[PDB]
Design a protein around this ligand. Sequence first.
Ligand SMILES: Cc1cc2nc3c(=O)[nH]c(=O)nc-3n(C[C@H](O)[C@H](O)[C@H](O)COP(=O)(O)OP(=O)(O)OC[C@H]3O[C@@H](n4cnc5c(N)ncnc54)[C@H](O)[C@@H]3O)c2cc1C
Ligand SMILES: Cc1cc2nc3c(=O)[nH]c(=O)nc-3n(C[C@H](O)[C@H](O)[C@H](O)COP(=O)(O)OP(=O)(O)OC[C@H]3O[C@@H](n4cnc5c(N)ncnc54)[C@H](O)[C@@H]3O)c2cc1C
Ligand SMILES: Cc1cc2nc3c(=O)[nH]c(=O)nc-3n(C[C@H](O)[C@H](O)[C@H](O)COP(=O)(O)OP(=O)(O)OC[C@H]3O[C@@H](n4cnc5c(N)ncnc54)[C@H](O)[C@@H]3O)c2cc1C
Ligand SMILES: Cc1cc2nc3c(=O)[nH]c(=O)nc-3n(C[C@H](O)[C@H](O)[C@H](O)COP(=O)(O)OP(=O)(O)OC[C@H]3O[C@@H](n4cnc5c(N)ncnc54)[C@H](O)[C@@H]3O)c2cc1C
Lengths: 370, 370, 370, 370
Amino acid sequence: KTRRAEVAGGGFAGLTAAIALKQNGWDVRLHEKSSELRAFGAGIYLWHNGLRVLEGLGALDDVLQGSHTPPTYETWMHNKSVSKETFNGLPWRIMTRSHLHDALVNRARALGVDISVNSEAVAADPVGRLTLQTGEVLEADLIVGADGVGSKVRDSIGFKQDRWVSKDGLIRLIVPRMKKELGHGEWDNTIDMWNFWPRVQRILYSPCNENELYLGLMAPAADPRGSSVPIDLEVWVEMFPFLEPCLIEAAKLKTARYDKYETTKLDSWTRGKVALVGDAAHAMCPALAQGAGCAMVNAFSLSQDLEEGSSVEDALVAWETRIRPITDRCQALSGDYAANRSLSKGNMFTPAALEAARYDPLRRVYSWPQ
Amino acid sequence: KTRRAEVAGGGFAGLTAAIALKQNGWDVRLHEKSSELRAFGAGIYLWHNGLRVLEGLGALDDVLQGSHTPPTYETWMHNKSVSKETFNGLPWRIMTRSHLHDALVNRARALGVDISVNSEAVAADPVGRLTLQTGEVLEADLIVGADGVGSKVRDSIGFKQDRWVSKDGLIRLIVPRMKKELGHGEWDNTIDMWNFWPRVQRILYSPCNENELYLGLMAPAADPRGSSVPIDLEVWVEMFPFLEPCLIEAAKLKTARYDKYETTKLDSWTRGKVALVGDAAHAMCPALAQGAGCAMVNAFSLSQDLEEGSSVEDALVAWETRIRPITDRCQALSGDYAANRSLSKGNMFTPAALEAARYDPLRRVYSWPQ
Amino acid sequence: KTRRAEVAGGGFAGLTAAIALKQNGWDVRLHEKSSELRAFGAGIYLWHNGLRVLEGLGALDDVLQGSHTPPTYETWMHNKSVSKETFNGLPWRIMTRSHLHDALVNRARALGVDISVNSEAVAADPVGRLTLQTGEVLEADLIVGADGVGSKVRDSIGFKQDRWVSKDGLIRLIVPRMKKELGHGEWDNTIDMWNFWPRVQRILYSPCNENELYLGLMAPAADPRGSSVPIDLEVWVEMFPFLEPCLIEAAKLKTARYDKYETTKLDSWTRGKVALVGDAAHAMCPALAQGAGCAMVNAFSLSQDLEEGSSVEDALVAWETRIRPITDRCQALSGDYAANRSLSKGNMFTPAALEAARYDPLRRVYSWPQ
Amino acid sequence: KTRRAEVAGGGFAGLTAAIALKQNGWDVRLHEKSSELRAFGAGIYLWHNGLRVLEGLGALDDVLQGSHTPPTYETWMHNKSVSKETFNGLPWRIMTRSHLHDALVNRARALGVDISVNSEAVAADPVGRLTLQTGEVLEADLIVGADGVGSKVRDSIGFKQDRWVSKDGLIRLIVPRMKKELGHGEWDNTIDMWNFWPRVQRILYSPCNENELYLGLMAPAADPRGSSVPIDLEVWVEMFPFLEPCLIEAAKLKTARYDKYETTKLDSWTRGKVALVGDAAHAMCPALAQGAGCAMVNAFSLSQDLEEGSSVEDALVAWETRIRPITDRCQALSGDYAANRSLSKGNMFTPAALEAARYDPLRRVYSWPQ
Ligand SMILES: Cc1cc2nc3c(=O)[nH]c(=O)nc-3n(C[C@H](O)[C@H](O)[C@H](O)COP(=O)(O)OP(=O)(O)OC[C@H]3O[C@@H](n4cnc5c(N)ncnc54)[C@H](O)[C@@H]3O)c2cc1C
Ligand SMILES: Cc1cc2nc3c(=O)[nH]c(=O)nc-3n(C[C@H](O)[C@H](O)[C@H](O)COP(=O)(O)OP(=O)(O)OC[C@H]3O[C@@H](n4cnc5c(N)ncnc54)[C@H](O)[C@@H]3O)c2cc1C
Ligand SMILES: Cc1cc2nc3c(=O)[nH]c(=O)nc-3n(C[C@H](O)[C@H](O)[C@H](O)COP(=O)(O)OP(=O)(O)OC[C@H]3O[C@@H](n4cnc5c(N)ncnc54)[C@H](O)[C@@H]3O)c2cc1C
Ligand SMILES: Cc1cc2nc3c(=O)[nH]c(=O)nc-3n(C[C@H](O)[C@H](O)[C@H](O)COP(=O)(O)OP(=O)(O)OC[C@H]3O[C@@H](n4cnc5c(N)ncnc54)[C@H](O)[C@@H]3O)c2cc1C
């Protein structure tokens, strides 16, 4: 009859998969383990590739309204501007995580995607059986493992993998823009503010709209003050005095967390009727701001390959073969950028760095040449 | 049988119409009066609306490759920077006219649009008859008058109209970028360089790619030196000394022309099976850089309305009703900006000014909110 | 016995003469027509030449304390910075008129210069007789006519002369610095802010110290709004919006005057025992800011020539021959700068323009080479 | 009869002493150990205090002609401008060492100071006997020990002292300005270019005139590349790429030396008829650029105290009591600035830092208030 998909995970990968499948006439249920649908991480960047996914999902309008494209992506080293990049017109956007989340959830609900909260996938069978923590066993023609770095859809089946959790991380927050209080400057810009002296402290400054500012405060875990939550106001104001008004607001946040970086890589993304998408398959370093971009492109591309009249099993194999190398290359380059601190030099959004961003999943070609 | 369209005019409107119709399965012939297909005017700006038309035409890739999006659209008054605008991420692009022309011609030929040069439409009959200067009479289900401000498709039928040719104009040229020679600055920007003192002289500085620069040199016709062709090098270097390397190259051009501004407005754009598109119907002041944008949106939109299963006559009426107000408003605002010299103030690409640019003809909604 | 000098006028020329003579052992009385000692004109610039006079007068310490040397002398045309000049280290200073006045008066009193207020010289006899408006006739070995452009010491004797009072002028005021309120900029600079468009309005911005700002607001007399006192706040804020906080304070001043420019030139500066100094002899255009500088150098130089053991009559002739050409050249060049609006171009403090400033009256050589 | 002075040392202290004494009618001979009169160290800064000494010596004109006052004293940290200081008009000047040397030598010769080269003082007797390495014993009313950090006039007598030679130092050179090749910037400025990351390397950039640039390249002795002579071009270009044209010229200099810092401090500067001046008495860290300034003020002040009608012995005691505290304070503060790297912060030419510079030795008061 009507093809049935069960999607595990209510993040950006899972919502993208669910919407894309529902648009193509699948009956879709999405399962979120948490008690409510929420997106963590404060803010997020999307690029052309991700914006094209949103267009394909019919969720672009709600995203662009109330989000921001900075006039330029600027990099500082020790308070000296070292580069300003605009990517030869390649579209990009900054927004709060909740803003993107809301657009996707609203679109899924409008389409009639069934959503279950407090519903955790704990086992998946490649023949198309999904077991929830409740003991309910669902039969489906497709099972999507969009359940994050700790994917149980993945681990119940067994996928050869390398995972890494870093010792280091960052504190991500949303604070008021305080634009007037920042005084003279280019405060609508993205500004990646690097320092190695007198200490290793960095802030990625990311306006989301006229009201909200996304800050990432990065210091090594071995730095007891820089890695402290709620933030140690003094050590941040000392090295970023021009952001004092915003940092004062940041210091009020008792919910602040020092989140560590984490990566996953698998030899394969499929097993029978099961496809792994997003961080379940390819969590990467955030240097190129493509973790969700690739997750969304991959989820959308999955729906495309399922429209070819092949068996689900064959479509899934074809899907990975077609789409995975863009992600493998992006993940590898992101990890290398992170390790070499490449972004600190500025002008590092090269044609190769922008490969993932340049991909248009709708037409399946690369656009916005560099 | 197969629906037949005859298109008069090989400009951007005519090529857009021809491609769009051919993609929808029309048999299409395009007639260009001139001995060869060529686009005059040196350079051109397109925005989101026009870029979306190109996407819809399958001609976007060839356009983006080898064209330019400046990091910002900057305005100067008396050499003082008064604004820098990036339109909240709204896509835009600068290119040579030949670059856009070539992309459209190549796409039309790839699709099998028949093209006749030295073929001038001199009379059109609303019942679907087109007479060429050769005396050949063609029967068609649709006749597109894309034959410019002096449209004979229009005037052979008789459309109530207001036309205006200004006394004033400008000299448009392509010269080498000479980027190194320009020294320190932001020479990838669009820079609209206004002056009223010591004389009324203005240059719109518009990089097209890494090799080619589009310059518009604007001075009143009453100024014998500023309006002179080939350019009077001294009076331009005097007020724009920072562009001397480029102006020296400009002064070599014996083909330079002082072209006067011209507008057309009609009470109606249709008569039976005849539709008027582009400058034939709505030539406007270039302040908002939307003359071709609107022409292309209108031509593309025409093809859309012809896919509704209506008679051609009814589709044409529906087309104008649907699409004309965007153009009427843009034309009116452009004319008002020109007359009031509004752009000289900077920060004048307001939400209202950007209305046409914001329109997405593919989805028929407004995007890129301001 | 002790040589007796009577000095007419309590301006900078008269006070300089009185101090310089008293230091050399003259008995000196100074006569000021006005009811009190006061200096009008809001603020004033001095340069190396004038500062050296102050040193020679023992009045330099009180002047430098509480006055200002800007980091640079900056010129704007239509809000674009066209030059920044620092004169190769040549000393200069800005102060309120009252500040300079007070230093000179205090020094004169410390030395025992007799000062009479409400004492107007109405006739001077070259044999050494001075008649006051009171009818008192004083005998002296030297009479100094330091009584301004309308000198009665001069006109009672009869000196061939050319005088000119311009139709145009300016409004000079002292207002609070409002430095914080001016926001980002270089607000300790001298900034000469020229415009010809949209109207002829100019402000010379001249900080005097951390508290007081000297403004000169210049517009043609034919401009009813720009030349209005108290100032027409709107027309000044319109063209100088960045000075709004200071202009708001300026608009409160009910004492503001539109003062017209005035020049004097004489074929000779001496007659018997009478010497004319300052505006009585050589009032000039203020372009080079040397009116008082030359007056002070000339007054000081007069005292020098009187130490040569010559008759007073011979010393006076020698004095004019020695010192007058520096003033003649400065006056001529200042007038030419004013008429040609030369300062509007920036970088016009050339070696020739700075000749007067470069003169050291103490050592009688030119210093601070350019 | 005529008072006789013998001066040991042909540096700035010795020449200043010799000129000042000769002007007051002393018979003066100066003894320089080296085979010729020469000044080492590439370039030098003087301030108001030193410029006033030059005025008092009649050597100011030859110094100002062909030397430079930068528009501002600028400080960079990691290529970010952190301060621009102009010292509220306090006069200052940069020149090559040879330029200052030549002015002083020419003045000494014009006055008839006797100069002996290859003449080394090896012993001084407080009763007024000077023994040269030749075995010649000279009798004098005054012996000036201006013979540098290794003063034998000092050490032959025995003065309790603390001396320190640092392990660290710098490479001082004169190179062509290469102003055009430096491109856009403020290349007439003094720019103190600090870095601690990626390595400790600093350049003090000091224009001397339109032709000559004084560079100080500072790196720790423990850095084998940064401290290398002739300069290791690559490691300097890497951290100061904007100076590449000048550094290329610097790398040609086979005479370049890595000179270590050195200080001296004594409990007393006098013994009978012997006075110690300059580095013989008070060599200091160069942070405040006052080593020669203080030497010159002290030498000039010595001549002043010898005009009081006291015995030479009493005049010398009075001299030290009067003048030494300015030097003690300057030396102490300079050393503290050096150790704390205070100048790296910018805005450190405070009123206290500028105390020595503010002293006017001619009038014996402090001028140019801050
Ligand atoms: C610091 C940082 C900055 C980043 N910045 C960007 C950026 O700017 N742009 C960008 O594109 N990407 C960015 N990323 C990466 C991006 O956050 C992720 O790649 C993306 O959120 C992955 O989404 P997902 O849906 O695969 O997984 P997740 O977001 O982890 O979502 C899975 C959802 O899984 C639910 N769940 C888990 N287990 C189960 C289960 N067993 N059953 C049912 N539900 C389950 C999880 O609770 C959750 O609701 C960044 C990442 C980090 C760490
Ligand atoms: C100075 C200036 C700057 C501009 N800048 C921009 C800009 O930046 N961006 C933008 O979008 N627009 C811009 N425009 C407007 C843009 O140039 C026009 O709106 C656009 O080129 C109109 O195209 P069209 O096809 O309608 O007409 P045309 O370009 O005039 O083309 C019609 C073609 O008609 C052929 N022809 C004429 N008569 C016949 C006939 N009887 N039979 C067959 N063929 C015929 C003409 O020869 C020609 O080949 C600008 C205009 C001006 C004047
Ligand atoms: C707009 C403007 C800006 C200027 N800016 C500068 C500047 O920046 N730097 C600079 O150096 N110069 C400047 N000047 C010029 C400077 O103001 C004059 O040259 C200077 O004040 C002349 O001084 P004085 O003593 O000769 O005459 P005055 O200042 O006119 O003084 C004479 C004194 O004469 C008293 N008096 C008059 N008649 C008699 C009498 N019969 N008997 C007794 N007393 C009498 C007058 O009342 C008064 O008290 C400027 C001038 C103008 C107009
Ligand atoms: C890196 C550096 C930068 C500096 N920058 C500045 C600056 O910008 N401004 C400033 O004011 N100061 C500066 N100084 C300090 C300044 O260089 C010295 O304080 C000054 O040159 C000391 O001069 P002097 O005459 O006392 O001694 P010296 O310059 O050492 O001269 C004494 C002369 O002594 C001769 N001599 C030695 N022994 C005998 C003898 N026994 N008999 C006869 N002759 C003898 C020496 O050969 C020489 O000719 C700087 C110093 C250093 C190290």
